[PDB]
Each structure stands twice: as structure tokens, then as C-alpha cells.
Design a protein around this nucleic acid. Structure first.
Ligand SMILES: [K+]
Ligand SMILES: [K+]
Ligand SMILES: [Mg+2]
Ligand SMILES: [Mg+2]
Ligand SMILES: [Mg+2]
Ligand SMILES: [Mg+2]
Ligand SMILES: [Mg+2]
Ligand SMILES: [Mg+2]
Ligand SMILES: [Mg+2]
Ligand SMILES: [Mg+2]
Lengths: 122, 94, 102, 36, 95, 82, 49, 55
RNA sequence: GAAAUUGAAACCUGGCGCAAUAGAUAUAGUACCGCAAGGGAAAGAUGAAAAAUUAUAACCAAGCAUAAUAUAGCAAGGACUAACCCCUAUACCUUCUGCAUAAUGAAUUAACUAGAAAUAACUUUGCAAGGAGAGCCAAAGCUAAGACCCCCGAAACCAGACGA
RNA sequence: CCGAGCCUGGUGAUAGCUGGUUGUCCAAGAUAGAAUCUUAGUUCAACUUUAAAUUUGCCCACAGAACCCUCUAAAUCCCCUU
RNA sequence: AGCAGUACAUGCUAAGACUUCACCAGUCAAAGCGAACUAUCCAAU
């Protein structure tokens, strides 16, 4: 009988080797997630279909931003095999009211508050 | 083709994503007057601003929640000290 | 060919007086504080409040021959335990209200 | 202040009421359903 | 159910319903419990008491009974010393 | 009578590619920014106000206003040049 | 456009082929190198911000 | 049986009923028939309110 | 499925009826079929003048003729300088589980050929503690309107005739 | 084609089960259960439409739900936060 | 299992609930009064 899967908490305990590989920092966890759907919910259980809709990931390859909190992570763990999770990076800090119209989310996962579309000098 | 290489350079995997090729104006008036913003670019500006505002909203909500929890803990410590000794002990102790 | 018996009200649920907490063929959950028993071993709330399930030491009635025989044959130092369901009264019996100023 | 008199004032400009420009009140007629 | 009588072209009432049910003007239908008069000797006092109660019908049953009776049976009546007079009108019903 | 099917090298590389992404998903899910206790109630105010908007929309349904100009305008169907 | 160039602009297309061949060789040299050496002239990527 | 500016009556009714409800009352103005439709039962309050005006 | 009781109008010469597969079956109960009772069709089209007939132009279904055919395939589609060659495409319907290359149906054209309720409720008016042009309903109701229920296809049974 | 003629009428007889059921657009829209001389059908259920009123729905933290020997794991019920 | 034992307040009344489930039917029950105080129709009356 196929049923909902409960993953052991060990799977989600990052080791010292993982930190070097992925570049995370356990002392300072990232605040927000970048979540994109990269797998179809077709041929998947209905509970996974519901989680995808709740998270706002019905459209594939569409970045959604979510809080890195236990309750949200519990939902992501259910559909972890259908999504890509990448920490949101703010190299220039949060966008201010002036910068709201000039932001851009790059593929690296960084949100830049200035988007000139010009070449960088030298 | 070239999707993985473009990502390595920090560019969008698809060359039709973000960057001058897509976002810059296709045309302008011959005299130099700028053209009106293209419909696709206007939609992207709206979508990006909505994404940025959500980023700020979620960040502030987490920060405000973190501060509120800290205050509750500090108050609990103060509450413990509130009733340390209302009345001086006077029985069997000198 | 099946019937439904078991816990109608789970831990922490709010019940009103007369609510049926559980139905059972045999005593699986015992009546605790403010929990009545029916002829068919049905457990029902005697007061309005929150349902609680606890583990309490079991002491049968001295005239319950079958149960007294069991506890007398137990090794000294061994205490029987059972699951009890209780209702924590949510409201006071009443209040004193000013009705006249004679 | 004028609501009844305004409607009659509007009538003066509009074409003569006749059998050619009448219609039922919207919502008073349900469209019939046809198996076709 | 006859929707169009042969002689009057009018809907008819199911008299079986009139024999067994009371319709309150508010739309509720009252009935007796099946077997309230049968085999009392083998029934406990508690079972006998609920068997002699006047109980309401559910929504689905009430709508069916309404279709089976004509408008005459739904009119307001002012019988003298009617035992069910107070029950014809609902009170404090928010819905 | 199912004929056997075999796993190509390209299929194995495709599967390995998915495993790498999910393995990274496990890492980023490992470092929650807040604990369960601190998260509690931080979003309560917004979650409640959002439902009030839903409730306000669900209780404001009413038939639209009817205007005289709409009815009288139908007389223009017979408007003609003098 | 590349197919159109191949037919109507053979000299320009040969240049594009020469440019692709040069970049391919620069990739080969970099693969042999450990990264201590500098990147190829045509390898250098223009950055946008 | 509303005559004249029905919209003026709608605003007067909204100002009168909004304190009691705590929100702007949902209403429909039927200009053709001269009818103001209000969501909820305010027949008793509106009757006294209209009586004071002098209608 | 009553009755007591109640108690109205009514001026032939008209039609939001059919117009040759319709409307009568009807040009006719004829032709024709049957021993008999009985069953029972089909169709016509000039013009003011035919004592104007070389006058009344033609253009339109299927079927043909003018004018057979050229590798390859549900007959097309993408196209193409180019009809074909290239590429793509397992007729349709019905039913069998949501599966027809296996089972059903269809030569083709034309005509004919199949959803008919208004109690409640809803909607839109009217009036409103009343509504309705007696009767009925009414603790916002009541009056009026709108909108809902197909076609073809047994054996049998009964009555009265007809027939050795 | 007489295991009981033929004709007319009753008669557009009944049942049973197939088949058929004619313009367009938009919105919503696929469930798999119980009783029955009932399983080729039906009516209460499941899902489903429209309108209306109101307030929570889904996901789900801890705690909590039996002894009798549990294959005893995979799970369930309940459930704030989110 | 289509019963038996053995009581005779298996009296009356009434909040709130359960239920094979849909219906019918079925089930539990505080307080109170009084005690104790330990299938349908049909057929017979
Ligand atoms: K004929
Ligand atoms: K003879
Ligand atoms: Mg009479
Ligand atoms: Mg004819
Ligand atoms: Mg075939
Ligand atoms: Mg067919
Ligand atoms: Mg002879
Ligand atoms: Mg749709
Ligand atoms: Mg909950
Ligand atoms: Mg008692």
C-alpha cells in the first residue's frame, strides 16, 4: 500500500562535508528560499498536488520566494523531489522603496537592486 | 544549446531571459525620441516589483517575529525577579 | 459487516454535558473525573469542559470479586494501571449577581 | 433634487417612443433552452 | 403522483401522505415512529418512550412530501385550541 | 507478453542529474532560520486580515444598480437623420 | 540566421566558423591548464549589470 | 415610492445605518422604479428615521 | 374522486393556419392489391393573347459529357518555382472500462425527420399588511410574466367482421 | 411462417433493450456507494450545476487514543502554528 | 444467537450525544418528579 512518506530527520542534518560542497553557513542560516518547480505533478499523489498549489508552484520554472521556517520546510520536504531549493542572496541588501522597480533575480540566486542592462567597465 | 555555460557566467540559461538582448528597447524614433515601453518589458517590471515587495514583506515579518519572541523571553526573566521576596522571612531564621 | 466504536472525543476536545466521549464493547478507557458510564459501558461527559486522557493507578471495588482476586495475586510492589478519560470543567457553577437594593 | 423630472427631460431629446423601439426589462425573460 | 387529473387537469394530492404526516406552516413535517404500537412487551422503557415521540422529517423527505401535496395542505389554519398552534411558526432561527 | 526494456547511459545520466538537485535540496532544508517556537504567531496578524478581506468580498454581493439612462438609451435604435 | 548566412554570406560564415574553431581551441588549452594561466582572448566574457 | 434624487437618499441611508452596522451598508439603487434595496433588516429603524424627516 | 353551494360571458363571414413529400387519403376511395372483409396510391405549373410556338434568355443537387490514366498508400496537410515526387497524418459513428486496424451503421443527392410541466423556488415589474377584476393566499406577502420533462421499433390480449 | 387464419377497431396498446435526437460562444463540470422478485433497471447516497447567507476550510507542533501478546512495520485518528 | 436466568419504579419526564448509515430502525444519558435510600396496511381487543 503506497502512502505518505515520512523522511528520517537524519536526512536533513547537514554534515561538515556538505557545508564545504554547497557553500552554506550553519551559524547564519539564509532567511528566504528560492523555490522553482522542475517536475510535473502528473502521476504524483494528490497530497503532493495540493502542496504544490499551496506553495504557488503550479507553473514550472517560475521562482517563488518562501520563508525558511519549520512550517514551510515541512511542506517543501513533501515535494522536495519536484522542486529546486536555492537560498536567496542579497549582495546589496534588501530593496528599498527607490529600488523596487530596478530589481532583478539572477540565475545565481542573487537579487540585485540595480539593473542597468549596461556592460561593466573594463 | 549553451544553457549550462550561460548559467556558469551568471546569465539566464535561455538567452531570451534577462539581459540587454531582451529588455532593451527594440526600436526608437529616427529623430531619437524613445519608443513607448514594450508590453513584455512592462509585464516583467510589474512581476519583478511584486517579487521584490514580497521579498521585503517576508523578511520584515521574520525579523519582527524574531524580535517579538526575544521580548517575550526577556519579560519572562523579569517576571521571575518580580516576586523574589515580597515579605521578609521571619520564622526560624535570624 | 462492521460497526463503529471508539473515541468520539479526542484529547483536548471541548465537550458539553451529555456528550458521548467513547463507545466500547469492554472497558478499554475507564471513567475519570466528571465522566459517566452507561449501561453499555458508554463514556459520556457529566460537565462542560476539555477531555483529557491520563494513566491512573487502578484500584477495584472491594466487592468486585473478579478484580480483587487479580490484585491480591500480584507480586508485592506491582501496581496496575489503566487509561482514564476526564473532563476539566471549563465554567464555574454560577456567579453572584446584584439583584436588588432594598 | 430632480430625478423624475430629469428622466422626462431626457425623453425630450430621445426619439419618439414607438412599437419599433420597445424591449422587456433585463432579467424579466429567461432564454429558452433548445435541445438543438 | 398525478400531475394532471383526467377530469380537471390539476395536480392531485397523495392521500397516503395526509394519513401519516402533519405539515407545520413553517414547512416542517411531523410523523410517528414506525412500530410504536407493536411488540411493546419486548421493548425497554427507554426504547418505548422514543418510539412514542413526534419527530421531524429531514430536508429531503420534507421537499418530497411538499411535492406530493397540493397548496391546500400548506395554507395557514386557525383551528380553535389546536395543540400544534405554537409550532407553526419558527422562533430565533438564524439559518 | 512484455518485451524487456533496457537502461541507456543517457537515461542513467538523466537520473543522476535529478539526484544531485534533490541532494542539494536536502542541504538547504537542513538550516531553518527560526525554530518552531519562534515562528509561532509571527504571521497571525496578516493571516487574519487576509481572511477578513475574503469575508468582506463574500458578504458584499448584491444586485448591481439600475439606471434610467440605460433604459431610455434603447430609444436611440430608431434615431434617424431628420 | 546562421543558415541564411551560410548560403548568402559565405565569407562571413567562414569567419563565424573560424571564430568558433578558435574558441574551441581556447577551451582545449584551458582544459589542459590548471587555471594558473590566463584565459584566452576570445574566451573573455563581457559582463552586464 | 422614492421621488427625486434617489442617490441622495442612498447617501443619507448609508450615513444613518453605518454607525449601527459598523460598516457601510450594502445597497442597490433602482433608479427606474425609484426603489432603494438594503441588505439586512432595518425596516423598523428606517421607518422611524423617515418619519422624523417628515415623510 | 363528489355534492350542497356558487355563478360569467357569447355580435358568423375570421387566422403570428398548410401551399403539391405540406395541407384532406383524395386529381380518388379511383388506379392498383385481396376470394372476401379490407388495404390503398402517384401526380400539376408558358403567356394579356397559342386565332402569338422558331418563344418562355440563361446561370444551380447528385449523375454524366466537354476532358480516362503514370511509382506511394483515409487521399489531406505543411508546403513548393513546380499537379505529383519530400515530410507529417491508423476514416467516421455507436458500443465494449475512459480501449475499435477485430464488432455495429452508412452508394449518393434532394426533401422530410425527434423535449410537449409552471406547484414551489429563482429573476424582473405592480401594489403592499395587504395582494388579486368574488372563490385564494397572507406572521412581507400577494399578483403577473419568464423559464423544465423526445422519435422509431414485439409477441400477446379483447370486440366485431371476413374467408372452405 | 397457422402450435393456431385474416381484417378493422380497442391502439400512438404494453413491456424489454438497442438506435436516433438537428446553430454558435463563454463559465462550471468525471463520481465509482447502499437497498430492491434487485444487480441490462431504479430510488435514497458519492460526485456534479445555479443562486444565496455566513465563517472558517485545507495543509498540520507538542500532547493524546488497551489491554488481550503486536508479524509490526509502513500508516491512521486528532491537531495549534504556518 | 432465533434464547434464558431473575428481578416487577424494564416508573414518569427531560438537557446533551452516539449510530453499521442514506432512510427506516437502533443506542447512551445529566438534571427534575416519584421511589428506593441501598416495517406498513389488514385482522382480533
Ligand atoms: K397522399
Ligand atoms: K363450400
Ligand atoms: Mg354542483
Ligand atoms: Mg397530398
Ligand atoms: Mg471496423
Ligand atoms: Mg450506429
Ligand atoms: Mg369446396
Ligand atoms: Mg471550463
Ligand atoms: Mg486545524
Ligand atoms: Mg437522574
Amino acid at each position: 500500500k503506497f502512502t505518505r512518506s515520512r523522511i528520517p530527520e537524519k536526512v536533513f542534518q547537514a554534515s561538515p562535508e556538505d557545508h564545504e560542497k554547497y557553500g552554506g553557513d550553519p551559524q547564519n542560516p539564509h532567511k528566504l528560499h528560492i523555490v522553482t518547480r522542475i517536475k510535473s505533478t502528473r502521476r504524483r499523489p494528490y497530497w503532493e498536488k495540493d502542496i504544490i498549489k499551496m506553495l504557488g508552484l503550479e507553473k514550472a520554472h517560475t521562482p517563488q520566494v518562501h520563508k525558511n521556517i519549520p512550517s514551510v520546510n515541512a511542506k517543501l520536504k513533501v515535494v522536495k523531489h519536484l522542486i529546486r531549493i536555492k537560498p536567496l542572496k542579497l549582495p546589496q541588501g534588501l530593496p528599498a522603496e527607490e529600488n523596487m522597480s530596478n530589481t532583478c533575480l539572477k540565475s545565481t540566486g542573487e537579487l540585485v537592486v540595480q539593473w542597468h542592462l549596461k556592460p561593466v567597465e573594463q | 544549446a549553451g544553457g549550462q555555460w550561460r548559467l556558469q557566467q551568471g546569465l539566464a540559461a535561455n538567452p531570451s531571459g534577462y539581459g540587454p538582448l531582451t529588455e532593451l528597447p527594440d526600436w526608437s524614433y529616427a529623430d531619437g525620441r524613445p519608443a513607448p515601453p514594450m508590453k513584455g518589458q512592462l509585464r516583467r517590471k510589474a512581476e519583478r516589483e511584486t517579487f521584490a515587495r514580497r521579498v521585503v514583506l517576508l523578511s520584515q515579518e521574520m525579523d519582527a517575529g524574531l524580535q517579538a519572541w526575544q521580548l517575550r523571553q526577556q519579560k519572562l526573566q523579569e517576571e521571575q525577579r518580580k516576586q523574589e521576596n515580597a515579605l521578609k522571612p521571619k520564622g526560624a531564621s535570624l | 459487516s462492521g460497526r463503529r466504536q471508539g473515541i468520539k472525543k479526542m484529547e483536548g476536545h471541548y465537550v458539553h454535558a451529555g456528550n458521548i466521549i467513547a463507545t466500547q464493547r469492554h472497558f478499554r478507557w475507564h471513567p475519570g473525573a466528571h465522566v459517566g458510564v452507561g449501561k453499555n459501558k458508554c463514556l459520556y461527559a457529566l460537565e462542560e469542559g476539555i477531555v483529557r486522557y491520563t494513566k491512573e493507578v487502578y484500584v477495584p471495588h472491594p466487592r468486585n470479586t473478579e478484580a480483587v482476586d487479580l490484585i491480591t495475586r500480584l507480586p508485592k510492589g506491582a501496581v496496575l494501571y489503566k487509561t482514564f478519560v476526564h473532563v476539566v470543567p471549563a465554567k464555574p457553577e454560577g456567579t453572584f449577581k446584584l439583584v436588588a437594593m432594598l | 433634487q430632480g430625478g423624475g423630472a430629469r428622466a422626462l427631460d431626457l425623453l425630450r431629446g430621445l426619439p419618439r417612443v414607438s412599437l419599433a423601439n420597445l424591449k422587456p426589462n433585463p432579467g424579466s425573460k429567461k432564454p429558452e433552452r433548445r435541445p438543438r | 403522483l398525478t400531475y394532471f387529473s383526467a377530469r380537471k387537469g390539476k395536480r392531485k394530492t397523495v392521500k397516503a401522505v395526509i394519513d401519516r404526516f402533519l405539515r407545520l406552516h413553517c414547512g416542517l413535517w411531523v410523523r410517528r415512529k414506525a412500530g410504536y404500537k407493536k411488540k411493546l412487551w419486548k421493548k425497554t422503557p427507554a426504547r418505548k418512550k422514543r418510539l412514542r415521540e413526534f419527530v421531524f422529517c429531514n430536508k429531503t423527505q420534507s421537499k418530497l412530501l411538499d411535492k406530493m401535496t397540493t397548496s391546500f395542505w400548506k395554507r395557514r389554519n386557525w383551528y380553535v385550541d389546536d395543540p400544534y398552534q405554537k409550532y407553526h411558526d419558527r422562533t430565533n432561527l438564524k439559518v | 507478453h512484455r518485451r524487456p526494456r533496457f537502461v541507456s547511459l543517457r537515461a542513467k545520466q538523466n537520473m543522476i542529474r535529478r539526484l544531485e538537485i534533490e541532494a542539494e535540496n536536502h542541504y538547504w532544508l537542513s538550516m531553518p532560520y527560526m525554530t518552531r517556537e519562534q515562528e509561532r504567531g509571527h504571521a497571525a496578524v496578516r493571516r487574519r486580515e487576509a481572511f477578513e478581506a475574503i469575508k468582506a468580498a463574500a458578504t458584499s454581493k448584491f444586485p448591481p444598480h439600475r439606471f434610467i439612462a440605460d433604459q431610455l438609451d434603447h430609444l436611440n435604435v430608431t434615431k434617424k437623420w431628420s | 540566421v546562421l543558415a541564411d548566412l551560410a548560403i548568402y554570406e559565405p565569407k562571413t560564415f567562414k569567419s563565424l566558423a573560424a571564430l568558433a574553431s578558435r574558441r574551441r581551441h581556447e577551451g582545449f588549452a584551458a582544459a589542459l591548464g590548471d587555471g594558473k594561466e590566463p584565459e584566452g582572448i576570445f574566451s573573455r566574457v563581457v559582463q552586464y549589470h | 415610492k422614492v421621488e427625486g434624487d434617489i442617490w441622495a437618499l442612498q447617501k443619507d441611508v448609508e450615513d444613518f445605518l453605518s454607525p449601527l452596522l459598523g460598516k457601510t451598508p450594502v445597497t442597490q439603487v433602482n433608479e427606474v422604479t425609484g426603489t432603494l434595496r438594503i441588505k439586512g433588516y432595518f425596516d423598523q429603524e428606517l421607518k422611524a428615521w423617515l418619519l422624523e424627516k417628515g415623510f
